[PDB]
Amino acid sequence: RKTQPYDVYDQVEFDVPIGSRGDCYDRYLCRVEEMRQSIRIISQCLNKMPPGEI
């Protein structure tokens, strides 16, 4: 998403979480913060919706 924008993802502000020790509790916390950043992308998407076309 951050490297190759396949859509307008380059114009929403978030940060993908990184792991630390390559580990299942650590991977769990990575999933949790990916959920949190999905909430932030929903917030910015509801902020900047254009009334363009279907």
Partner: protein, 68 residues
């Protein structure tokens, strides 16, 4: 006229904080409460034990004087 669904007037903030209030107190207070209540129970148990020791000696007097 147009009747799409844009955000009408903009939507407010949405929280994403890890908001953990950390309910409770320090652990030294927890040790103080535990040792205090434990020692309270020890003193009350000691007093009741020696009261029943007095009554147990009285029951021994009953069995001594009752025997011949």
């Amino acid at each position: 006229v147009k009747q799409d669904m844009p955000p009408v007037g903009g939507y407010g903030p949405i929280d994403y904080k890890r908001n953990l209030p950390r309910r409770g107190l320090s652990g030294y207070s927890m040790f103080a409460v535990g040792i205090g209540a434990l020692l309270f129970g020890y003193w009350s148990m000691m007093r009741w034990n020696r009261e029943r020791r007095r009554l147990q000696i009285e029951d021994f007097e009953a069995r001594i004087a009752l025997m011949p």
